[PDB]
Amino acid sequence: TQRIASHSHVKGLGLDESGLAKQAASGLVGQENAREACGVIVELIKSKKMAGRAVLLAGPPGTGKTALALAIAQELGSKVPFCPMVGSEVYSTEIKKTEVLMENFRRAIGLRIKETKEVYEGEVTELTPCETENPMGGYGKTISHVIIGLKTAKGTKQLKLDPSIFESLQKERVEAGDVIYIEANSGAVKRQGRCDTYATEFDLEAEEYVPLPKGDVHKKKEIIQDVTLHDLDVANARPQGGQDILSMMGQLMKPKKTEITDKLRGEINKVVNKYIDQGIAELVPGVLFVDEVHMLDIECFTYLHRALESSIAPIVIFASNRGNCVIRGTEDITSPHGIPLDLLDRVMIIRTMLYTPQEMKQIIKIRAQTEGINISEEALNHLGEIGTKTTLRYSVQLLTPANLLAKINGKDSIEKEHVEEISELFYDAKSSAKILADQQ
């Protein structure tokens, strides 16, 4: 279990097979038009065909922009990357604004890579070479194979390797009675330690007296690892390793870290294309969600032209809040949603509506249901009535403190008295604004 947050109740866009909404499917109520619209863009994501497509969720605050923006994330499931960022995260000390944008852009493109690996392990009981006829003149002792016997908790089996493994085995310095690891395709021998059946009884040694392996001597499995392109980029930019004194940039943390196209494109898109066209990996192009996009700079908005016009881009959901508003970083240029007209020409706009009282009663009920509150129909109606006067979010937020008053007062559910009490302990924005307007 985990703590309840603002959007813990939304579990999907709530769409039936024709792509409509009944009235309140999967934790969202109302907004049928907007939920249908981003129902289309969910399938735009699932088809994996388009790049850099962008949609702007535009409406008043509290009209579910964030809610259905991440209901999209619920519809897509955890398989595809859904990368959230707020419009204020772009301003950074270490790295240029547009570089944050590029990092987030290909942080939203996933790559899930499937690879079987197959392994042999066990306590090694036999280690005998196999002599053969002299390949050339009479030196004797021509080793053609080497027999190695491995024991696990399942059974004991003997195995023939070619002599190169005899050399590697000796160079790994394994002994009879310890536990090894052999990787069939690659050919490695790794000593994972003397077998615990030869127990540490008075040995204090730190080298692992490793328990006898469970399961078969031979075991294979398809490892399935999903990485974002940004993970590959970062791992190539500042790599690990105990050598190459540059790798001892280890006291230092990592400023200056704007990644380079030569690497980004020239060295890292080729390997992804290779793995994809080889049958090793699948691209999972995801979503980049930018809420409060109005906080971006004019330089950022203009960079998004180029970024959204790329073939190697996710689809981008923007959410905005402001009216016709001054673009940040400009000298008094006013434009809709605080976003330059130039970028608005590039986004399909989804309009979110302001709720009716009925819809607000439904949302209040769902939020009470989610936070674990029991609420009487009278208290629910009163929350609805005081929530028609002020914002939905305040109406919803009164639930938990009112429930605490109920619990203190010994009640099992919110009686109307408690919502009345809380609505006088705490104010909303509008009431407080009136107080401030009265007193100086």
Binding site: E36, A37, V40, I41, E43, L44, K48, K49, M50, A51, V55, G59, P60, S92, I95, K96, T98, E118, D162, A184, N185, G187, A237, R238, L246, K256, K257, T258, E259, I260, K263, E267, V272, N273, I276, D277, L283, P285, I298, E299, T302, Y303, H305, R306, E309, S310, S311, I312, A313, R322, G323, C325, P336, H337, L344, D345, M348, I349, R351, L354
Partner: protein
């Protein structure tokens, strides 16, 4: 393999003839004849390459194919000539100055190519033998025409052992450096397969002479030489743009060395293109730098694009056309793109839905052209795919008028959005 269709995937280059005559809708580009012909002229001068630092500004309305023309030039120019595309706002770094960023953008679009003949041994390993002692051994190699045998020195034995190569591998030896590179398994490289091992990675073995002489080209951008000479770390060239290159005896020193290589013929200089999109984002300091960066003999041609006309320049309160000072504007040839005719709009939509692999009815084309002529072309391009998804959700075969009308109702176009913004949200 997976580089999804973006906004510009459909244009495979400028649809020009052998006489720089633009076709109406050939090679993915539609209409826009005059500006496309101008782009062809400057593309041919890019290819000829004998003039440095010439500058072109593609001006025009928002949406009238400026970026389409630029990427058409990029696609028609092809690889092996540097085309560096940059947004004007990319040069505002925290790690380096505006002018270092612009120098690096310029230099990243000049290539230096060193072309060298070298002799290799290419063959299928028939045997390798090697003794511990000053270890010593022999190697026998085959090509479809012949075989031969080599005695191996200690360093060669070491490098062969470092790759674990064996019979049946098909390999190259660079006679000058001795690095082995197994291209794969010859059909005689099959293991005994009495137990598990390496997979069946088979490939054909080589033909002709066992030892042969062939050409290798080492191409690096001027920024790339510059970076890797800057300081001994140098993997900077991949790490990040962490720079601030010292002008002192790196610009002049690289220029003199590359000019000497050009003159004595060791290297060929391949000047490319720097495309600055949304160049109006540059600072008056940036334009001031461009003035004299253009006036150089290691300067590529740079192309620029801008949507805006009479408006103040960034970093000051000076009005000017295109938002560029008439100082830099005097170094340029200006190519202005025109708005689209109804038939050009219809034909762009036709090509664009062909790229997106969606069928539409002619009435759907009619209404969508009407939409993209009343509102804006980009919106009509965005309705293609949305209507396609609406269509496929009803299991339709092709996009019909009702699909486009529905999805038009479903998404807004910044005109209807501003009209609906009559609610005073957070002004």
């Amino acid at each position: 393999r997976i580089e999804r269709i973006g906004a510009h995937s459909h244009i495979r280059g400028l649809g020009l003839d052998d006489a720089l005559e633009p076709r109406q809708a050939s090679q993915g580009m539609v209409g826009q004849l005059a500006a496309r012909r101008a782009a062809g002229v400057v593309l041919e001068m890019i290819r000829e390459g004998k003039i440095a630092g010439r500058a072109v500004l593609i001006a025009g309305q928002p949406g009238t194919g400026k970026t389409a023309i630029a990427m058409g030039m990029a696609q028609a120019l092809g690889p092996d000539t540097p085309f560096t595309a940059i947004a004007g706002s990319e040069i505002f770094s925290l790690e380096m100055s505006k002018t270092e960023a612009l120098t690096q953008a310029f230099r990243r679009s000049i290539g230096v190519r060193i072309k060298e003949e070298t002799e290799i041994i290419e063959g299928e390993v028939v045997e390798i033998q090697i003794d511990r002692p000053s270890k010593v051994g022999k190697l026998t190699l085959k090509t479809t025409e012949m075989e031969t045998i080599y005695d191996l020195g200690t360093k060669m034995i070491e490098s062969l052992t470092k790759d674990k190569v064996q019979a049946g591998d098909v390999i190259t030896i660079d006679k000058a450096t001795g690095k082995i590179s197994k291209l794969g398994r010859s059909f005689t490289r099959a293991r005994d397969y009495d137990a598990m091992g390496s997979q069946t990675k088979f490939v054909q073995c080589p033909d002709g002479e066992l030892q042969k002489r062939k050409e290798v080209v080492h191409t690096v951008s001027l920024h790339e030489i510059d970076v890797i000479n800057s300081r001994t770390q140098g993997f900077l060239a991949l790490f990040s743009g962490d720079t601030g290159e010292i002008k002192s005896e790196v610009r002049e020193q690289i220029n003199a060395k590359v000019a000497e290589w050009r003159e004595e013929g060791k290297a060929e200089i391949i000047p490319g293109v720097l495309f600055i999109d949304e160049v109006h984002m540059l600072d008056i300091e940036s334009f001031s730098f461009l003035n004299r960066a253009l006036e150089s003999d290691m300067a590529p041609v740079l192309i620029m694009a801008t949507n805006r006309g009479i408006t103040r320049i960034r970093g000051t309160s000076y009005q000017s056309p295109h938002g560029i000072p008439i100082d830099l504007l005097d170094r340029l040839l200006i190519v202005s793109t025109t708005p689209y005719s109804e038939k050009d709009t219809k034909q762009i939509l036709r090509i664009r839905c062909e790229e997106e692999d969606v069928e539409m009815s002619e009435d759907a084309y009619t209404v969508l052209t009407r939409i993209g002529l009343e509102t804006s072309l980009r919106y009509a391009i965005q309705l293609i795919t949305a209507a396609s998804l609406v269509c496929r959700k009803r299991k339709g075969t092709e996009v019909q008028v009702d699909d486009i009308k529905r999805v038009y109702s479903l998404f807004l176009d910044e005109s209807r959005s501003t009209q609906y913004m009559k609610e005073y949200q957070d002004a």
